[PDB]
Structure 1
Amino acid sequence: HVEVVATITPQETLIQKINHRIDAIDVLELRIDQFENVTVDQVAEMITKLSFKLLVTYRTKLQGGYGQFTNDSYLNLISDLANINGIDMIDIEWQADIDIEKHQRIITHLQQYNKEVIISHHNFESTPPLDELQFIFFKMQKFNPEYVKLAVMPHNKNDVLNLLQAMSTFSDTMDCKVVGISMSKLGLISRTAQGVFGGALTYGCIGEPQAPGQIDVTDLKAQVTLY
């Protein structure tokens, strides 16, 4: 079934709002890229301050995030994140010009620490043709991660169906979990009916949308319950 993720970007009242939606949350995603000079120590201090799996995500500015870290400092942060026991899922970004081996090295390491890995790719500018979508999913699942995630910006209805078709076909073949997101309200359907098409994770918000098209996890939960 589809798990509902609540995306947060902290730095108490937020704990007030979380426990409020505790029944709508299967996964809490602690975005950390919004802190300057983040350390695993700081992260670990935040987590210990928090029924749902815990996902830790560092989104590079080069992918819609606010994170300003080199490929090396970023990669090492991902690897170090593995030490925190309270972390169940870690998000590592993908991009063709990536140092494959190194990535595969960092991923196997995270899994060695029993962390669920989510290889992700974002494109806030447009939605690649179906074949390219299916392809990007392919490259990302080559590192045999727990989840493959692909968020893309639609410009028309077909961009939405294409994202849906790609994820659907994928969930029908691969032994890997898939996460497809067509951003904006135009793509809201990808978020609410994610389970219908084989999707394993759907992201909502805890107040204000953390990404284009997200709705409150309380509503998102109600929706996922319908389909």
Structure 2
Amino acid sequence: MLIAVPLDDTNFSENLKKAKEKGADIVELRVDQFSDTSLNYVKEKLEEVHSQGLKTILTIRSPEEGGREVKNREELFEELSPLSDYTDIELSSRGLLVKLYNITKEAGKKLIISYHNFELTPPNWIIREVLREGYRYGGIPKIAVKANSYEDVARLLCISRQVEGEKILISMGDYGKISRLAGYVFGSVITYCSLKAFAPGQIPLEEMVELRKKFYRL
């Protein structure tokens, strides 16, 4: 699996350098956490990541799913999606799905279609619908939901197998930590790390690199 680390624009150059040295394959630009969202500022950031040999995920999280409103969000996608290896758009932002799929497809890039639930792991039918809709819109479905028990972790992983295809599975919280490593066996293609952990369940980049080697020989 590929290892990604989210980053805002603070001390960016040095954090990118650290992400590289520590083994990150991807840097996710959380533009919703940027103090500057001009098309050039973000473009240069994407280019700087590529300059270091890493891939990028262009994310501009909507406020309803843990992000913040970005006035020129749609413009950023139009202009930068063709330049980022991946673009993460929320399944809930229905009006941009077809549009971002066409843009990424034509540019030979990939679309991640995400769903986040910071409170609980939804019923199985919802898990399956999110996955099926993601594939229906031509993207890599991503599900990030808080586990309130170990059962919630097992359930998310097991139910995901009922909808075939590469996907991204994350059980957030202390209970779901194991999902960040074990997800691979269930078809999860990307795992997300912290550049030390600041929240329950996170795993530092350096540690995940060694775990990936120990369990999957990469």
The 5 A counterparts of 1:95-134 are 95=92, 98-99=94-95, 102-134=96-128
Q: Provide the residue aligned with 1:18 in structure 2.
A: 19
- Match of 1:109, SS? helix
- Match of 1:151, SS? strand
The C-alpha deviation readout for 1:192-216, integer Å capped at 9, x for no partner, is 112111111111111444x652211
The alignment covers a number of residue pairs equal to 210
What amino acid maps onto 1:91 in structure 2? D
Bigger helix fraction: 2
Q: Provide the residue aligned with 1:47 in structure 2.
A: 46
What amino acid maps onto 2:65 in structure 1? Q
Change (3 A) 1:15 1:77: closer
Residue pair 2:60, 2:70 contacting (<8 A) in 1 also: no
Change (3 A) 1:138 1:155: same
Looking at structure 2, the residues matched to 36 and 9 of structure 1 have their Cα atoms a distance apart, in angstroms, of 8
Q: Provide the residue aligned with 2:159 in structure 1.
A: 166
- Match of 1:169, SS? coil
Change (3 A) 1:78 1:212: farther
Unpaired stretches in structure 2, ≥5 consecutive residues: none
1:149 to 142, 148, 163: 142
What is the TM-score with the length of structure 2 in the denominator?
0.86
Unpaired stretches in structure 1, ≥5 consecutive residues: none
The C-alpha deviation readout for 1:44-63, integer Å capped at 9, x for no partner, is 12233333322121112211
Looking at structure 1, the residues matched to 104 and 156 of structure 2 have their Cα atoms a distance apart, in angstroms, of 28
Q: Provide the residue aligned with 1:197 in structure 2.
A: 186
Looking at structure 1, the residues matched to 107 and 196 of structure 2 have their Cα atoms a distance apart, in angstroms, of 33
Identity %: 27
Tell me which stretches of 4 or more aligned residues in structure 1 moved more than 6 Å.
none
Q: How far did residue 75 of structure 1 move? A: 3.0
Change (3 A) 1:53 1:15: closer
Looking at structure 1, the residues matched to 171 and 114 of structure 2 have their Cα atoms a distance apart, in angstroms, of 14
What is the TM-score with the length of structure 1 in the denominator?
0.83
Residue pair 1:26, 1:53 contacting (<8 A) in 2 also: yes
Cα RMSD after superposing both structures: 2.1
- Match of 1:33, SS? helix
Q: Provide the residue aligned with 2:86 in structure 1.
A: 89
- Match of 1:214, SS? coil
- Match of 1:122, SS? strand
Change (3 A) 1:120 1:48: same
The 5 A counterparts of 1:39-78 are 39-50=38-49, 51-65=53-67, 67-69=68-70, 73-78=72-77
Change (3 A) 1:116 1:225: same
